[model samples]
Target: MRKIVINGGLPLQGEITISGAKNSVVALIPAIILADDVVTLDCVPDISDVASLVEIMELMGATVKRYDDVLEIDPRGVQNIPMPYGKINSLRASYYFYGSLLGRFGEATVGLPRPIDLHLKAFEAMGATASYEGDNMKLSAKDTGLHGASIYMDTVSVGATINTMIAAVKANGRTIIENAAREPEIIDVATLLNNMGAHIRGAGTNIIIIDGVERLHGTRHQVIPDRIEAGTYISLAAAVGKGIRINNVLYEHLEGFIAKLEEMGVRMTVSEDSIFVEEQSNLKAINIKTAPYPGFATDLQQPLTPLLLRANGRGTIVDTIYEKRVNHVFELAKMDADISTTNGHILYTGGRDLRGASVKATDLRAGAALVIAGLMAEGKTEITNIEFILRGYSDIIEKLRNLGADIRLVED
Candidate 1:
């Protein structure tokens, strides 16, 4: 319905605060189905992903009340009705229903995309099986019911790990997850689940153990501030800002990403809860390899791509998680970015001038990269397919405008 237009080469200055984590909040909303009463979540971002989740929650019969950034969910009346395929495909994170529905009704009737293999294998280990009809999948454990079993994830996946914990908490016995994703969001979900009467431990570590319980009660929780959003501003501040201060950040959660910024000589004054990105010049380029938690995050890879153009030397990047995540390569080329990709690896020649041109946001982070590119390039940059950008970032135009970005959301 809208496209974003940006007047390029403006030095963004001022302070911008981070919103709640999209990755965590998305799964947290679905995980509430296991609660016996109402659950309240604070610091919910006003984003499309949240909206779509709220859509399904209401359609499935949950009472959702939103006031500002707070979300109150009464999931007691939530039904296991078939999750519509169109709604499920509206955004990522719908796979979380596989765990929550099975935990509540011993089955899940939801539609999904390609990331269900790890989730399916983890569920099968807990005595579950899935059947496909049309584009929807029905995973059931109602026959023998769910029983805890030791399951090891072949990959360190945040989605698979959180999904496993939600269903495992209500299983008959005990479940152990080895090689689990060690992301901070995983710990946040475990914290909320444990407060609501679930037995879970080692959430922030490589292994997690969950003991089954009959029922879980409601509780109040607050999601962590969005690290990807925070990192995006950090890149913007470094790429084109005179001085920009990022607030409401957990420094520990962004250690790996911060290390990369530091390697590129992006000066920053770190504080208890904020980071002030100083103006930069003559930065050096560095190689990057995206990995699991505690490594360079795959989510932040694209946002950092635009900033690499400001650095000297050729920078290389390899995304070990998603192979086709380089859709931004061609899109950036439309904006005059000297970037290319080969075999899932990205290469960019730094210290090049970027001129604004028409481009499309192929994905979430790619949209952010295009925004960054727009802010750093010369002339007007019109970014189509902005829904991809709206999916993750909350109040993006206003947040950028507050930092002195000449950006606008226009009707298409």
Candidate 2:
């Protein structure tokens, strides 16, 4: 296991450049299979998730080359093969290949950690055959050829929505998706597909329209800045920083989150491409409920936990998206944070003097929450299971160090 050691109570101040959207790149990498030629993606984040996707592509006989933040994936030599359990189980985004493969080769056999019923159901709605054996799922579109159909999602799932779009973009006719996820990453993927000769419209709305195309050509696309990464740094700046400026950010993408932070007494200066945040002595407690896009993001809730400790009063967080996302609540309590959970809602009483202690990152965003708590605590804090953090964030230790944080990574 790898661990992150932090000497707490260091003031973080400086400009940190945001990387490409982790959510977008993961889907985009798999979407490349829908194209018939080589596709180049610019500004890709150097994270383990992207690496895992690249490995999967190479396993399927695609020639992938990386030069700094750029990735060129030539799918001409790609083959339809069963994706190994080790690679697919490494991250949830691996399921995206199922749709791309079904669209490209009419068959896919991949392993998934959890049952992706929604994705499979969307494929079935579009005239695909799906069956599961233990942890592995088999999907085939040989009989129906993935004809376009209207799909209504039971709930707004970004994964299912994007996967269905990838499969339906080259189907027979028009595919209409109702109650689709309107996240910025969805729009990014749609924009990439549109640039590559796919007909897609109304990406940012709850309804999306996709007209089937015979083939997609190679294209270049630059991913949008990661709003989740931008929000994490903004939370870090509020927790233990004197002042910090985050560049390469889209102000409109984070309007809801930025509004919430400003309402909690944090001072922010917003520009076209950057946001400057300064520490506030008297932070106010606020209630947050996680919802779909244009609402408080579920991904930001965990990263916002440690900073909530600085609030003067009581704060409550209700994660309607994932009730079990309160792993960080238990971990933060190890650092002497006055927080508790009741009926899936986290109740936090701020103004506690947090002391460093050993903790574990139960998940990706939970890992980010621990890092923020470690920086705000006293003395040394050791965090294990940091691989979860590395799957998404790129050069996190180096970026925090650039912002004057005392953090380092060690292998065990």
List TM-score per model, in order: 0.86, 0.88
Write candidate 1's Cα lDDT for 1-412 as tens digits. Answer: 7899999888889989999998899989999999999999988888888988998999999999999899999998997798877788877777888899999999878764556699999999998999988777789995768999999888778899999999999889999999998988999899999999999989899889999999999999989989888988889889999998898888889999999888988898988888998899989999989987788889999999988999999978999878779999998888788899888889899888999999988888989999999999999999998975775786789989998889999997
- Each prediction's whole-model lDDT (CA): 0.89, 0.88
Score candidate 2 by lDDT: 0.88
Q: Which pairs in model 2 have colliding backbones?
A: none
Per-model root-mean-square deviation over C-alphas: 3.2, 3.0
lDDT of 2 by residue, 1-412 (tens): 7899999998889989999998899999989999989999988888778888888899899999999899999998998888878767777587788789888988898775634789888888888887779987789885758888889999789899999999988888999999999899999999999998999989989999999999999999998999998899889888898989888888888878888887888888888788888766898989989987888899999999888888889989999989878888888998999999998989999898899999999989989999999999999999998886876687889999999988999998
Q: After superposition, how far is residue 403 of candidate 1 from its true place, in Å?
A: 1.2
